[PDB]
Design an enzyme around this catalytic site. Structure first.
Site, PDB file in Angstrom:
ATOM      1  N   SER A 161       0.811  -1.224   0.000  1.00 46.40           N
ATOM      2  CA  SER A 161       0.000   0.000   0.000  1.00 46.40           C
ATOM      3  C   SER A 161       0.849   1.282   0.000  1.00 46.40           C
ATOM      4  CB  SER A 161      -0.995   0.001   1.171  1.00 46.40           C
ATOM      5  OG  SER A 161      -0.370   0.103   2.430  1.00 46.40           O
ATOM      6  N   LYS A 166      10.950  -2.249   3.676  1.00 44.05           N
ATOM      7  CA  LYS A 166       9.717  -1.617   3.273  1.00 44.05           C
ATOM      8  C   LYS A 166       9.792  -0.106   3.575  1.00 44.05           C
ATOM      9  CE  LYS A 166       5.844  -2.348   5.487  1.00 44.05           C
ATOM     10  NZ  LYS A 166       4.596  -3.079   5.861  1.00 44.05           N
ATOM     11  N   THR A 220      12.999  -6.232   7.641  1.00 40.45           N
ATOM     12  CA  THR A 220      13.083  -7.592   8.176  1.00 40.45           C
ATOM     13  C   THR A 220      14.119  -8.433   7.409  1.00 40.45           C
ATOM     14  OG1 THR A 220      11.335  -8.499   6.743  1.00 40.45           O
ATOM     15  CG2 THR A 220      10.605  -7.572   8.778  1.00 40.45           C
ATOM     16  N   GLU A 221      14.453  -9.615   7.917  1.00 33.78           N
ATOM     17  CA  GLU A 221      15.275 -10.509   7.119  1.00 33.78           C
ATOM     18  C   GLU A 221      14.435 -10.927   5.914  1.00 33.78           C
ATOM     19  OE1 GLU A 221      16.394 -13.394  10.011  1.00 33.78           O
ATOM     20  OE2 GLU A 221      14.352 -14.211  10.102  1.00 33.78           O
ATOM     21  N   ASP A 276      -7.361  -6.525   7.640  1.00 34.38           N
ATOM     22  CA  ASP A 276      -7.389  -6.609   6.184  1.00 34.38           C
ATOM     23  C   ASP A 276      -5.970  -7.011   5.698  1.00 34.38           C
ATOM     24  OD1 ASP A 276     -10.174  -5.247   5.963  1.00 34.38           O
ATOM     25  OD2 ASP A 276      -8.994  -3.631   6.795  1.00 34.38           O
ATOM     26  N   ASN A 290       1.597 -10.010   0.457  1.00 34.22           N
ATOM     27  CA  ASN A 290       2.793 -10.017   1.315  1.00 34.22           C
ATOM     28  C   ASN A 290       2.794 -11.222   2.264  1.00 34.22           C
ATOM     29  OD1 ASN A 290       3.397  -7.497   0.013  1.00 34.22           O
ATOM     30  ND2 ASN A 290       4.052  -6.573   1.938  1.00 34.22           N
ATOM     31  N   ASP A 308       3.609  -8.431   6.442  1.00 36.91           N
ATOM     32  CA  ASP A 308       2.832  -7.212   6.610  1.00 36.91           C
ATOM     33  C   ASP A 308       1.921  -7.323   7.861  1.00 36.91           C
ATOM     34  OD1 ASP A 308       0.811  -5.230   6.377  1.00 36.91           O
ATOM     35  OD2 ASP A 308       1.155  -5.015   4.213  1.00 36.91           O
TER      36      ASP A 308
END
EC number: 2.7.-.-
Length: 387
Positions: free
Chosen positions: A83, A101, A188-189, A231, A236, A250
């Site tokens: 998003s 991200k 993250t990894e 939601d 992801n 996510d």
């Protein structure tokens, strides 16, 4: 209406568009306009086309000049959309592979006008599902979009879910890399695999197993963890066919629910599994899923959908998630709360209304078929003991 023209305009408000997509379950299933589903896929993949220097603005602002200094490698094309951000592969100075991200700059400040613009485009497309009117989508989307902006809190949610799912044989949550996290960046990894919204080509038996595990997770979020993502963003969720595992990337807008909400909700699902329509109605009005004044066809949209959930949970036979009738009923539940009411309900009531249906709908998209009574009886029994 012409697809690439719509795609181009949606890309200017991609954060709002994709978030709304998640909330409405806009995907290639038996119900959604296929042109609309394809447009939303194109918007996702068009993260490839978003300006370079927008990303580096965010990285600059958030961890200054020098960030590159942390990395052996920074992939400039994102490999996924999320998003209001997009996810880039990197390799830290050292070799450790990560997924960064990165938020688009200034999303928090353009929320109202972006949601405004999104509804203009969707209104003119004439592709919105029946019963969904732009003016009733605005407020809920503006609020949820602001929640998505909080990547510090998303990192905290990811840490908690990693703890909850420690040792799990199927699901895993990659470790947060604190040195590459900020208010506008979440790292993250690295994880690998099929995004689930692209997993339709897997064998029936593998799709069944993925989706059985997804619905179980939904029940555990609701009735065990009391910690749930409303939601999810199935694009992801990543299935690794080698390890036979799904990675969860996510955690935007994850919610804690108190006993009062979850108590009443499980009574609604129990009633539906017991085929008690009147009790589902009464408790739905208590919950304010319904005000009690809806026109009969809209009341029925709600009741028919909840009773379909109950049907699955009451049957020892495999439930077929992919039928066009089931897919339609679950989608048509969504507009029930999206209307002007005399009394606006709590934000979290909206989110709870959509949660289980969203999980049924990724099962529909993947044409899963499996028995659901056991998972529900387990979840219900477990919940009742602590009562």
């Amino acid at each position: 209406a012409n697809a690439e023209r719509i795609v181009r305009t949606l890309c200017k408000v991609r954060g709002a568009a994709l978030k709304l997509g998640q909330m409405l379950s806009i995907q290639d299933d038996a119900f959604i306009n296929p042109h609309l589903a394809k447009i939303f896929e194109r918007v996702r993949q068009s993260a490839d086309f978003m300006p370079l220097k927008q990303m580096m603005k965010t990285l600059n602002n958030d961890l200054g000049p020098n960030w590159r200094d942390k990395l052996e490698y920074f992939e400039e094309r994102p490999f996924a959309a999320a998003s209001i951000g997009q996810v880039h592969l990197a390799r830290m100075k050292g070799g450790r592979e990560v997924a960064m991200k990165i938020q688009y700059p200034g999303v928090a400040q353009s929320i109202n006008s972006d949601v405004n613009n999104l509804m203009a485009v969707l209104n003119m497309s004439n592709m919105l599902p029946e019963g969904l009117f732009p003016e009733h989508l605005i407020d809920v989307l503006r609020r949820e979009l602001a929640l998505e902006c909080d990547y510090q809190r998303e990192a905290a949610c990811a840490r908690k879910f990693r703890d909850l799912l420690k040792g799990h044989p199927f699901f895993y949550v990659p470790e947060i890399v604190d040195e590459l996290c900020s208010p506008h960046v979440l790292t993250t990894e690295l994880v690998s695999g099929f995004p689930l919204d692209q997993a339709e080509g897997l064998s029936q038996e593998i799709r069944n197993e993925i989706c059985y595990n997804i619905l179980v997770l939904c029940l555990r979020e609701l009735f065990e963890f009391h910690f749930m993502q409303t939601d999810p963003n199935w694009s992801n969720f990543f299935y690794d066919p080698q390890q036979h595992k799904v990675a969860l990337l996510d955690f935007g807008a994850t919610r804690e629910y108190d006993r009062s909400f979850t108590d009443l909700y499980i009574q609604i699902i129990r009633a539906a599994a017991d085929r008690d329509r009147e009790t589902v109605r009464a408790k739905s009005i208590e919950m304010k899923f319904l005000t009690g004044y809806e026109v009969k066809v809209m009341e029925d949209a709600h009741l028919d959908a909840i009773l379909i959930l109950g049907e699955a949970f009451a049957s020892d036979e495999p439930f077929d998630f992919g039928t066009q009738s089931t897919t339609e009923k679950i989608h048509n539940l969504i507009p029930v709360m999206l209307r002007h009411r005399l009394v606006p309900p709590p934000e979290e009531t909206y989110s709870l209304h959509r949660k289980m249906g969203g999980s049924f709908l990724i099962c529909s998209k993947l044409k899963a078929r499996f028995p659901c009574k056991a998972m529900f009886e387990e979840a219900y029994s477990n919940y009742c003991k602590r009562q």
